[PDB]
Amino acid sequence: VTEFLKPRLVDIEQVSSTHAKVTLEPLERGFGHTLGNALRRILLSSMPGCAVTEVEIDGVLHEYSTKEGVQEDILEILLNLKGLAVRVQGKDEVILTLNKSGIGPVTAADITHDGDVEIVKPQHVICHLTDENASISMRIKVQRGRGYVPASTRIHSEEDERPIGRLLVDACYSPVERIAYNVEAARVEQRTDLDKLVIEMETNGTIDPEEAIRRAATILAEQLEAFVDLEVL
């Protein structure tokens, strides 16, 4: 009559590896859009991602050079490596080593298998080796962050980057790509005017959908609790 019906989430249609479709069933009137645009802005704004930051290729000084025996320029290898989605499972920062020799493409499956680092798609090409006795070796530094952190604001105190042969990539620690909520009618029996918010996220693979919604509602309620205890001035 006046209390409310509280939303509880219901089934998580993992309709692809990256796609997802969550549904929040017994929603009250008008809180559909209120929670929907809140969760779209929160999910799209700030989630914990595990993008890469520093690549130290073996015989490479700077990214504006080429490398002999490889087909992309080094800058194109960095642009391929920025889009490498990778879910670190145990810690904060980690270093991935890639060693590959001989002709063929280099997918990300050739990255040395760690326990706590799970490459989500091993089909993702990195660079194209084009010679028989040509090889590559790099230490991809993967660390966990939040939001777009470019390389310009990355270098605060130079962080002892005295090796010149270490390249710095811009970071995009944000697993989500699109959210699109959708309200409709909720067919509970003894009620007509309810909603059922159907959030349809599209991650890159690192984040779980339920953990995406759980971190989103958590971070909203924790920003909220400067109000529920008002503390007037």
Partner 1 sequence: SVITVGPYLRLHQCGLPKKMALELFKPFIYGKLELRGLATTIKAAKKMVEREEAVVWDILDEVIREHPVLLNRAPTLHRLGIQAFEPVLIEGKAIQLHPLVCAAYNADFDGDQMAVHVPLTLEAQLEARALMMSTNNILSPANGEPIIVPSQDVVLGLYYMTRDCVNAKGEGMVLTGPKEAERLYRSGLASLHARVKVRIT
Partner 2 sequence: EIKELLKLGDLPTSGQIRLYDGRTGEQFERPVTVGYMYMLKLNHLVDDKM
Partner 3 sequence: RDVHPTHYGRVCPIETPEGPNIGLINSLSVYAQTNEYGFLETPYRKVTDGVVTDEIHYLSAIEEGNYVIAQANSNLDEEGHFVEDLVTCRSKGESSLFSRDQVDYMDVSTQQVVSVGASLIPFLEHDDANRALMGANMQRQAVPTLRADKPLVGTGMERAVAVDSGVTAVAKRGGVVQYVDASRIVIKVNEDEMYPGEAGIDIYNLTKYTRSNQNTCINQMPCVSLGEPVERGDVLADGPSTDLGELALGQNMRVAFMPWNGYNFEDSILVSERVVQEDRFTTIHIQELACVSRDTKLGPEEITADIPNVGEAALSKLDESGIVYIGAEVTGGDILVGKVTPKGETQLTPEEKLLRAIFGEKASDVKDSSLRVPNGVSGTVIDVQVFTRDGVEKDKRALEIEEMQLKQAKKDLSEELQILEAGLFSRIRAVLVAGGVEAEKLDKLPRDRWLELGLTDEEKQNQLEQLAEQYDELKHEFEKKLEAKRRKITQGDDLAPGVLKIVKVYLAVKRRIQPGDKMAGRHGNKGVISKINPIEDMPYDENGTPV
For position 209 contacting partner 2 by CB under 8 A, the verdict is no
Which of partner 1, a copy of itself, partner 3, none lies near 141, with the C-beta cut-off 5 to 8 A by kind? Answer: none
Read off the tokens for 33: 């859009």
Contacts 24+ apart (CB under 8 A), 108-117: 108/84, 111/140, 115/89, 115/90, 116/88, 116/89, 116/90, 116/91, 117/86, 117/87, 117/88, 117/89, 117/142
Which of partner 3, partner 2, a copy of itself, none lies near 95, with the C-beta cut-off 5 to 8 A by kind? Answer: none
Backbone angles phi, psi at 222, to 5 degrees: -80, -25
From CA 136, how far away is CA 60, in angstroms rounded? 10
Question: Binder to a copy of itself among 30, 59, 150, 165 (CB under 8 A)?
Answer: 30
For position 37 contacting partner 2 by CB under 8 A, the verdict is yes
Q: Which of 59-80 are b and which e, b meaning 16 or more Cβ less than 10 Å from the residue's Cβ?
A: ebeebeeebeebebebebbbeb
Distances, alpha carbon 177 to alpha carbons 11, 12, 172, 183, 205, in Å = 21, 18, 11, 20, 11
Q: Which residues inside 173-202 make contact with partner 3, applying CB under 8 A?
A: 178-180, 200, 202
Per-residue binding string, partner 1, 143-182, x by CB under 8 A, is: ----xx-xxx-----------------x-x---xxx-x--
For position 2 contacting partner 1 by CB under 8 A, the verdict is no
Secondary structure class of 51 (helix, strand, coil): coil
Q: Which residues inside 79-108 make contact with partner 1, applying CB under 8 A?
A: 79-80, 82-83
Q: Which residues bind a copy of itself (CB under 8 A)?
A: 1-2, 4, 6-12, 24, 27-31, 33-35, 37-38, 41-42, 45-46, 48, 92, 144-147, 173, 210, 213-214, 216-233
Q: Which residues bind partner 2 (CB under 8 A)?
A: 33-34, 36-37, 40-41
Q: Which residues bind partner 3 (CB under 8 A)?
A: 29-30, 33, 40-41, 44-45, 61-73, 75-76, 79, 103, 128, 130-131, 148, 150, 152, 155, 161, 164-165, 170, 172, 178-180, 200, 202
